[PDB]
């Protein structure tokens, strides 16, 4: 337990955590200073840097698991970090599927450590995620409303305008868009009205509802304070 004890002192020491944090931030600046219009030996070097950082993070997380004998898996943030470092390490020696370079996305994902390996970010994000369930009821209600209105619209406005309402998916997308009040009249409703004149009666109540529901959401937040 002497070597184990030394290793644990190293892991829990603020020095080790700060070292990892600065290493992560440095890696973050490293990947960040990436301009895709390159295809320049720079791009290849980025992979090398990522390689080293991932190896070091594997070292760190192995030490963390050894120290937190299963205890860290119970902790969500530790499990999340183990998972992220795992995905980064996997993409490191595994290869992309030809059709779609999804794994380069797993390599870039690694950047989320800035929240998990950071305790202040960890605690604040934990506060906000503790807040959300109090509104999970409203989230589910609003999602159900989206589902219902989406099916109705797509079944109505499918003949022509398939891009916006051809199926349930584009219908969900376009309804979320409308909720945001982003080009909802000029690019969507008015072209629709050109063919289906009374489509307005559809969206205006919808707007009401969602905006109303969203204000209720803020009210719920003003309830927790």
């Amino acid at each position: 337990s002497h070597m184990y004890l030394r290793i644990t002192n190293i892991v829990e020491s603020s020095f080790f955590t700060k070292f990892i944090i600065y290493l992560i931030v440095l890696n973050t600046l490293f990947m960040a200073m990436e301009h895709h219009p390159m295809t320049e030996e720079f791009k290849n070097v980025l992979a090398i840097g990522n390689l080293v950082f991932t190896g070091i993070f594997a070292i760190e997380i192995i030490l963390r698991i050894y120290v937190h004998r299963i205890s860290f898996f119970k902790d969500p943030w530790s499990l999340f970090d183990s998972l992220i470092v795992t995905l980064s390490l996997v993409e490191l020696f595994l290869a992309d599927v030809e059709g779609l370079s999804v794994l380069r996305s797993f390599r870039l994902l690694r950047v989320f450590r800035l929240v998990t390996a950071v305790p202040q970010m960890r605690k604040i994000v934990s506060a906000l995620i503790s807040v959300i369930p109090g509104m999970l009821s409203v989230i589910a209600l609003m999602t159900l409303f989206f589902y219902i209105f989406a099916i109705m619209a797509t079944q109505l406005f499918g003949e022509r305008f398939p891009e916006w309402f051809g199926t349930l998916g584009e219908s969900f997308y376009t309804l979320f868009q409308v909720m945001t009040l982003e080009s909802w009249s000029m690019g969507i409703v008015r072209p629709l009205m050109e063919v289906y004149p009374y489509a307005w009666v559809f969206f205006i109540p919808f707007i009401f509802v969602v905006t109303f529901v969203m204000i209720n959401l803020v009210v719920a937040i003003c309830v927790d304070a």
């Binding site: 992979a47 020696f93 595994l94 290869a95």
Partner: peptide
């Protein structure tokens, strides 16, 4: 011959069957 798994690769030193070159030879999804 060819460059084995995890050995360096380039335009003239290609990866052995079943691998793809990304500075080093990686394995292609099964």
């Amino acid at each position: 011959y060819c460059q084995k798994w995890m050995w360096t690769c380039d335009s003239e030193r290609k990866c052995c069957e079943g691998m793809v070159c990304r500075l080093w030879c990686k394995k292609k999804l099964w």
